[model samples]
Target: HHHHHHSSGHKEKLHTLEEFSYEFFRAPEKDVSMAVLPLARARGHLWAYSCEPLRQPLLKRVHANVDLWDIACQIFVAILRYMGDYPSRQAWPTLELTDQIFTLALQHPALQDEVYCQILKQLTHNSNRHSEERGWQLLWLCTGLFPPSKGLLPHAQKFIDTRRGKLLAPDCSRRIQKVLRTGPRKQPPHQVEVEAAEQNVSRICHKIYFPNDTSEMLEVVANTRVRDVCDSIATRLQLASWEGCSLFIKISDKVISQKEGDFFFDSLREVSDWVKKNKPPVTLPYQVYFMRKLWLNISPGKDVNADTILHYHQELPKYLRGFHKCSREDAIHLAGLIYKAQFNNDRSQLASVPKILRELVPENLTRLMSSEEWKKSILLAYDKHKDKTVEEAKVAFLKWICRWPTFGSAFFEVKQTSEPSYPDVILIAINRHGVLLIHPKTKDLLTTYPFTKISSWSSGSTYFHMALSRLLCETSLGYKMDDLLTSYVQQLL
Candidate 1:
């Protein structure tokens, strides 16, 4: 049939696609209890189990407004859950699938940047628990990921028991609020008391109502943000002001004296940035609190920088004026606060405090390579040279990739240039962002080493850095990966 159009250049309205009726789902309103909820839940569970590939179809039906990748992740979880009791197949999928998702998440344009992390964490947790059928495996995973002394392992143990070995959902908002209420004190609490409270809070989050002692304050501020950290510090310590160099000296001194560098510097940088960006003259309490914390936590590396010189020389005297010679109570409280803040951020579902690291000071910090440097390195990925001395090519490649904030160190595998072919570098990039397996290539003529052994780097942890530039080209570049994404792992090539 011929469609009609108006001469005025306005086309007649097009007919809408006919709405097909399906028995499976119902409209949202009309008493969903009778028409929808039961069917949806039943169908959802059933569809999740159907042997035929249902991931895409299920995703399409559910995520009308969002991208299918967001929901497709559910299928990933379901598959892992199905494979949970099975052990021989455990490490295989846990490593491969985790690497695949992490890489795809980095490149996926459909999902929100942060949402990539939500899925990343799920995969991390899933992979971590893959061997829980055996005992000590899960414990080791927690110990490596979270700093050992932070009670994370014990907290994890409690969480598993409390939730019946299922995923223990963390409460970021509740923990944030709790720490905000209890950071600073006149006297520091005992070490064991703080650890017990922290371990208890890990499973069941509540307000931080610890006594106003350094130990309790530290425990309360553990893994919290600068704003909350300062609030807790002030409440416990009775700090007068945040400005003045003397404050930095006292805090830096404590950190230097106590060897709590990680927690101390983290608190220092966070508060410094918060003050620089947000604090008013009156609320300088943050600066004072942060510097004092820094003195309490200084890293073992004693780099004599201007900040170090300025900390003691320019600001030490003026800061001690109003406060009487660090009262024993104040010292104890301050010391306890320093001690407890060392507790690792609880590893619940929403591990915000642990995930949200405090911003560091721009000064006295290491600078990463410029964006142009990154671009230049990516271009080498397209390099087509046939034969140069292997060392020369390796060095050239490093010149570019080394600029990345992620690049750590590189070692070439092949020793001689005359050798027919070999990979140039085995680079390691380990940081908060998952590890990235970077192997520079010549023309994609031959395959690189099988990434099947990615877990070789760190078997005890969930993070794996995988490389696939060669494999992708050889296997039709991810076009044939649907089965890999949706089906049983035993059939993998």
Candidate 2:
């Protein structure tokens, strides 16, 4: 059949494809019920899982429509057609999107069997690089979706064998076999959180995260030896034992390696003990990192300094690479890393700080600096201050710089003049454009009169006097007898 056309050649007497899909999902009446509650909950969970913010609202609309079965079918077909529009697999909806729908099916027993069959039919009919990837992901999702006795294993195995050579097919087949062979995983709540103090009687479990990849994690028992942990990690990652892989836990600024020796670790118990004794208020279990010992010039059996500056520098960039996409808390964490690394004698790494920041967040840096030269100059000023007290202040300022590059470092003074007995204590307040003054005694804020208002000054025998932009001579705080201060004041000006 041909589409009806007007005299002018445009199609007429019918709605567009988008309009039809919209009407296909529209319900005549609300069908809210306890049965629909699971579907409703699944919508938000899927939304949270989705990387695309726009797709999340589509899930809300799909769940809210009372005609669940028809709406699901329409949505499924629409996704298939939209994915077919793009030749490249990357342009297609992510495998996670298909898993989201499967997760929804898992929650609703009424929808389970039919949903899987219909999805399989759609995906199989649309066989291509993209859809096949979704098929593999579905097979993975089904492992957790269906119980062992439910007989999904046989169907999943056949699907895997038939879809051989597709992305992740071999992994899917192995995963299916593993899931089938594994016994029941349910454990008592108390057993799950057994006290670390009773390690001799109760086994304690700790969650270990992949150092570079936050998305993956593993659970290990407290009694599991350090060598055993290393072996397990190597096996999971499909690597050989001679790779000399090691795990390190970071506490505050220190990195402690998990070396195998006469000493063994109850990692959970160890961290818990350390936390209690040291009272490190912010320490958490995920601070542990896994690295190849060979990279740090350590032999498999020999010991080395795990807390070296080079190691920290290497590890820092892994977390800081995609700085533009970091959260505010993540930004503060990166700032801390930069501050900690600045203490190292490695000037090359410290010099490369602004370059790393530039690459990670170029847009933000451009707003603050006329050129990269300005950034280097500010970094150099920060490096020149070596006084412990003054350096601490500079670190805080550097952190602020990363947090908001829009407000660059306006002014700084490494040392200030006062009574000879009480020297080095000074008052300063930093703002967006420049520095202002603050009262020294009560720690109260002062006006912009002194620095911002001053135009001229000269040194004399007893004291240096100044001429202000405004008439505020009585409020001026003058210091006595310092000739070298002339050059410092000129630098400030």
Candidate 3:
């Protein structure tokens, strides 16, 4: 079957393995119903799901001209729909093939990075609900490949950033995000609101995220209780302490832990409606996360788990914000943990410490010592904790701070509205212990109303009233104080 022609300098013939070229998907011209709609059900009529494996056979191009990009979107949409919800045993073939496709998308230019990009743009925005499902399927899986095409990364990043908890699955969005981390990415470049293209209260298959933004998609009626999501993700990640987990909704300006009786989708839609009506000023999106919103009655030593570490990350931001009157030595030690929680044990990140010190310690303490000297002591303390893992360091920091009187308290600065006051300026703190009034200048405890004694309370923009024995005191602080008082009173149990 081979002919060698040395005189003509022609090499022996070999098979052109690339037999099929690209072609746009079309139904037979007279298949009237499929004509006006992209609804042909481009059924693979694949020779063998009987033999079972790979959408590759059907997805290979079929044009007479030299091309592959022509049908690339069709291949993606075809697989997205065909295997979109196939049975586990029947549906897994797309897994192996989709893995290879991600590589080709990165390496094969004719797949047209932007072509694939625009395909998703249409599916996610301009098409039907099911088509959008396909878009997210593509979105969820392709993250396993590389990021969106570089040309669209910023728009895509901000686009994804803006939609985070809305139509986007925040946990799913973070899958792309986890890869985007070159580390300490600048506060995501100014965001442009990816408009609420269309409201999708119709989706029943929801993708819920973790505190860390890992996502899990599950099938349930839209209104099923979040208890199910809490149970599902909590058990999916680990079996222990499922009792301690709750589904928390991350709203733009604050946090909402799902109530035990609330229906998941109902609550989600409520947020959707409220945000639309009020139009929040902040830029972050809404996402539902599985988290530990409460705690065990007690624990003695450090325990390692995503939940505990989540608490570690959760509590870090508050204490780091210069709250609770930190001592200089305590500031250095906590600053050391900030290093561990961030850069790992390499110590090379010590160079970045001065740059991050403003965030790592209180503003006053940051200026309290010479920059070089403060960094030296931070490194000194960082070196002191040699055996702890990153999580170990984080958990250690929380435990160290927990022993302090102000550990879990929320603080507010207030000026006395009272007539005869020795301390005109006071600090108000609310925690499990109750309401603590402290001397602003000395950080000394001035008064305490144990939660048990708080009977009723009320507030206005510049005044707060507490009924301990019918009347307690009036303080001029932000109205946010009443909000905290109401919450702390609930913890009395």
Candidate 4:
């Protein structure tokens, strides 16, 4: 009857502690054990604890408590805790216990995560000879269970190298070091210097901030490119669509995006060295941020999660910094959204509005309307949105700004060296709408050169070259200028 492997509805239910524990320790008819749910952690005190002196008698009592539904839970905890430091001093028995632990976790399913977690937590900073060998085995096994936390991974990898496979003629050490490499170990630095450490797959942490003001210390390879890095983050965040997600390296007030080909460590290292050598007049902090870079084709929707929220956070900073172009009326409406989102209909500190007005409007518009007039109009608009939630108001703000042609443009200001049609000092705005030249002072759109009109484009060390309708023009924008233009041009549908 037990051999009849029933599928779907009909199957064995291992509910009680006795049945579960019995099924767990014993081999099953099939390679896979019957799925069993363990009781929600054991009640009252554990009879045995690994933190204290190990006692077989105490552990025996807990293991013998068969009727207690959570006995399996206690069994799981004690087994892992016991593994902390050669629970039983003898090496052979300890490994036998390890095999049993591996089986215990595989059977119960719920205890699998605990097995992984407990093993990692126990192995922390512990260089005990037994555990060093144990750590190697536990981690080797753990790699398949789940990814280890980035925090503990580096230390874990350090000892992996330190233990260094010292089988060394002793029977126990030989058994422990069995299957490890025994050879000259030195080939070439190229054989695996960084290559070897890499074969071990140890990673370094790179700190990244999200547009939503959230930050994470991402575990990344020094040479692994940004394309893979962003995708990993997308999986972690469960992003809806990953096309436009980008990593921006912020140096003070300015930022340059990390390219798909750029290495995370190399990019950060270059910037760090640049900051160190320049010693700028203004002391500014450089940091990395993950945000949306493109995909503004379809109008933004009102969905409250994923890239929508991320876009709001990213766009808000750029909007506040006066990057994208906005009409005077649209600017007021945006200010209203910001005020409502910031103030949340609470007028407790409302008087502080004028003092912080510079952050609300673009530079040109701030002076166009006097502070007294600007404050009142913005407050009147803020009041009109009487019943909107902070998030709704933010989404509403995006809906209003998303309509502008210049809303998501990458803005740059430079001298137009060509002594011809445009003013010497001009603003260049690049977005999905191709390119536009604007008056830097008044912030008015002076010329629009759609991508279809542009024939050939190139950029050199000091200038960006473009032949739009055979009208040659060049301006001094750096390397990022060409790449940003080319990517947008190629991807436009």
Candidate 5:
């Protein structure tokens, strides 16, 4: 089953919200027959939330207090913002009586706070119309919402920075100690593993970069990307990170507001490598150019996690026209490399590498390849690879590459097979010379060669690329490669 939507036009389907509310809330039979229109509306709101279309003023001003029926109707629209990125749970079918959307909204902490409870109680007691709908709304808000306390954002951010969930334990508390006297002493031990430090960097980067917006429901969290972090930090620093001094005021503002300068300064020192330096004064023309450079510098490395970069980089997306500054050609090429190397999927249509990328490779190679043929060749390689042991599998994989002369093979030893998320295949790779690694996505029928970064991409395709690139470079070049690989121009195509 493909995760993305296919290219067919919409097939008309019954609406679920109306049908559920009518049957369950005991609304008029005429209004409760289908589940199509409401479902579409709910999905639209979810997309809007994902894309951040709602303004805070609008959210704050919107009529959150109303009769049970009105709240029911509004709940469908508002709950969409918190749906996360996946879609399997979108349709509110099972709890049709009070519109499952409103039911979901009841889970949001923002809506279920003591303040909201007062509103719910008032609606139930003061209004003549049934507040049963609001009852479900309260329930929804409580179950679904996960808000950011400074602690929680940093906590979750740690999970994201590490390779999957490896670096979770944090020894130090960001909270002030003298203030919380009856509390325990905290420290960031140097003894921490490379993966744990990486997680810490990513979490802070996310918090520093992204903030809430006018149209969006509320985003206390930020997205992580080299581009996002560079843009954000530059903006905060007011330098030419993307061409201006806006960040100058931001950093100063934060500093002035800081009651604990020591801790903030210490954090600054720890995260200093992530800061992009030595750029000329900012101007409109150099904005995108400077940002791209920052991303390139910040993105690669294992020594320091890109999370810090991501923390501050969230700003670039909103200010820039596109989602990311890296060109399509570079992105596709890099995406293919990461997927093939990490996920064991040579799914690239070399044709899908973008026209400009095609131009980068020789005309002879272009003639030698077509997307269809590329896929078939990869599939053929997979067929030849089944039921093989470590050395044999490596030999068969190397042989598979004969079809594409452009790709030279590199083999590495499977140092270890047991890992937290991926237990199937063992890791195989070339030394630092090629900066490559290979791991099968599925378990083998024959000899054992463990998989490498398969666990990284399971969360999302975008991150899958990041995880693969990170591991290969880290393994080959040691922790320092994380910063080094980002600057090189070999985006793969």
Candidate 6:
């Protein structure tokens, strides 16, 4: 005997268009006969009908064959079920397809009256705990109704008032009225004003210069914060926020003192006030300067811990107080040379440090190294420390760079990197010669690459760039090469 192949489970059985049409149009024998159909099975079939698209001919056949009033009422009940079980996130396509089916059903004149009646009845049944929020969403969808359902209008207003849900009904009701009055509504005043303010704020611009002879004009608000300006400076310089950078003003060859509390400028007001105070007699245009603070003191030996390195790093900026006016770029380039030589353990590269150091050497230190015999003294110091690692020897050279008599008097130490937000400070110095990077608390020179040889680098965050510049310039003297401040050029395409 041959057995017939038949699928038994609900999912295994494939529902067809003919089956739906048969159930949809079979005339009811009594008023309650329509309710006799298994509602769960009917709803499942409706969902399946939406899933597959057999083309316009099939869609027209389904429409022509099905009872408009029955389909419309059933879809309303499906919508209610969806609302009752609303999740914070849901599959939008399924919900949208269901809504499209409901819209299509309502298109037939025979269905509109019954569909409206069914929707209003379900919407007004607000006894469920979830009804308040669910009903609010429904109100928006029904905003386009013309000659609105009289029974629905009163119940909707009452539902809206009693529930007092988020973005309450008054706003929604006004929006509905506006849409009815006009084809479309204009944006609310608050939103329009907010957008206008943003445009105005973004238009304000400030000009700043860097130690490398570079200049940059930045777009900022009239009331932008000082820290934000510092961040902009760091980003343009390709440094990190933890790198230790400071901002200064230059008025006719004078770099003004930046006191501890004075750095917390609210806006251009401080700049204006300072110009009035000190630059009153000045003839030249006022200028802003960004200086890279260096992390100077370090043993640079493996045995030395971070605390020791950082402990010494803290004293450098203070030591170079009044000396902030020196060429920072030059100091950074020297750091690069030393970092590269030390890493490569190249004695010839290391030997060239004295020449770069000569330019960066404190003005007062020139007196002590007044004689050529100074080279001999430096060599002797190198020989003594040569037993140490090349890094220690490089550190020994760095010591002479900062030991000048005027270091303490020329530089004033203000607060620096006080907050422990970033895990470690990154020191970065870039000049015409190239870029130099140093490790955090250890203050060890990490690497050095000539600008032309570099292929890629990361600008992690604006803060990182600012911090890195500050850390790199901590120990060096005098800016060199192109100042980070540059001409106000057109924006890159």
Instruction: Point to the candidate with the largest TM-score.
Output: 4
In order, what is each prediction's RMSD in angstroms?
28.0, 24.4, 18.9, 18.6, 25.8, 24.6
Error of 1 at 420 (Å): 53
Cα error, residue 242 of model 1, in Å, equals: 2.4
Whole-structure CA lDDT of model 4: 0.54
TM-score of 4: 0.54
Q: Write the per-residue lDDT of candidate 3 for residues 390-417, one digit (tens) a residue.
A: 7778777777877666666667666665
Task: Report lDDT (CA) for all predictions.
Answer: 0.27, 0.38, 0.52, 0.54, 0.27, 0.37
Clash number for model 1?
A: 40
lDDT for each residue of candidate 5 in 124-195, tens digit (9 for 90 to 100): 222222333333232222212222223223322222222121222122212111213322111111111212
What lDDT tens digits, residue by residue, belong to model 6 across residues 1-493?
Answer: 0111223433322222233334333332221347668643312222122222111212222346455435654555455554554342545433342344345533553443333333334444345545535444444333432213333334334433443444534544543454344332111111112232223221335577654345788654322345667677656544424233455666544454332222222222344454566433222355666554333232233323221232223334332221323343334433343343233444453345555444323342344443345444433444444355544534443454444322212221222253343333444444223444434343344555443454332222122212222331222222211123110011123
Give the residue spans of candidate 6 off by over 4 A. 1-207, 211-217, 235-245, 252-254, 257-266, 277-284, 292-370, 376-493
Deviation of model 6 at 30, angstroms = 78
Give per-residue lDDT, candidate 5, residue 484: 25
Question: Order the candidates by TM-score, highest first — what do you get?
Answer: 4, 3, 2, 6, 1, 5
Q: What residue runs in model 2 are displaced by over 4 Å at the alpha carbon?
A: 1-75, 78-96, 109-115, 123-149, 162-168, 179-493
Instruction: Record all residue pairs in model 3 with backbone atoms less than 3 Å apart, i.e. clashing.
Output: 21-63, 165-286
C-alpha TM-score for every candidate: 0.23, 0.27, 0.50, 0.54, 0.18, 0.26
State candidate 6's TM-score.
Answer: 0.26
**Residue 258 C-alpha lDDT in model 1:** 16
lDDT of 1: 0.27
